[PDB]
Amino acid sequence: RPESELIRQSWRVVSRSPLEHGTVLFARLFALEPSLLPLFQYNGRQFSSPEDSLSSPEFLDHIRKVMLVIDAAVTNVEDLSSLEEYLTSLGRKHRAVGVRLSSFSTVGESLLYMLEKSLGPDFTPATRTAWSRLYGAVVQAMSRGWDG
Ligand code: HEM
Ligand SMILES: [Xe]
Ligand SMILES: [Xe]
Numbered sequence: 001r002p003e004s005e006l007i008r009q010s011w012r013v014v015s016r017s018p019l020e021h022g023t024v025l026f027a028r029l030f031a032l033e034p035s036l037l038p039l040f041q042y043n044g045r046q047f048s049s050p051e052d053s054l055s056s057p058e059f060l061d062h063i064r065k066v067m068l069v070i071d072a073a074v075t076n077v078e079d080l081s082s083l084e085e086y087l088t089s090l091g092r093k094h095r096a097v098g099v100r101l102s103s104f105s106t107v108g109e110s111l112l113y114m115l116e117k118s119l120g121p122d123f124t125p126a127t128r129t130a131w132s133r134l135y136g137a138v139v140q141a142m143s144r145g146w147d148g
């Protein structure tokens with residue numbers, strides 16, 4: 001699958017500095033959808049501003065978790081069946097924490113933003129399409145967690 005190799009090659013670049021890259025993703029996310037900020041409630045407190053989130057080790061750990069789940073998806077690009085059940089429960093978990101399935105569209109745009117910014121000219125039309133398909137497949141599996 002040529003799509004899979006474009007994903008593998010672009011991810012190599014990102015995966016070298018995952019927290020730095022995931023930081024861009026989350027900064028962009030809160031800039032687009034500020035109402036996601038209160039959902040991260042560590043030690044029973046909510047973050048007042050997006051910059052507060054960046055000072056939180058728990059929040060930064062969650063960036064690492066996100067980048068790890070993406071890494072699993074890239075590893076399993078040719079077949080996400082090994083990941084379907086895990087991703088369904090991951091959706092269920094995010095439903096429980098208060099995330100609306102609708103917000104995963106903004107997450108997608110934030111992912112594509114991070115990739116465009118990191119890769120520059122190497123973020124070709126084909127690369128963008130490949131990532132949009134992989135992300136779509138991930139969200140499809142996660143969406144099963146929202147009761148159906
Ligand atoms: C809309 C954006 C998101 C929000 C508001 C959100 C919120 C949360 C919260 C509150 C937790 C529990 C606290 C914690 O573990 O730090 C969590 C856990 C987690 N998140 Fe997210 N999340 C988002 C997106 C994602 C995405 C897209 C992924 C996958 C690529 C992801 C991967 C994970 C993982 C692996 C955990 C640990 C779940 C567990 O095993 O308990 N997160 N998230
Ligand atoms: Xe952020
Ligand atoms: Xe963790």
Ligand SMILES: [Xe]
Binds near residue numbers: 066070107111
């Ligand atoms: Xe993501």
Ligand SMILES: [Xe]
Binds near residue numbers: 070073134135138
């Ligand atoms: Xe993804």
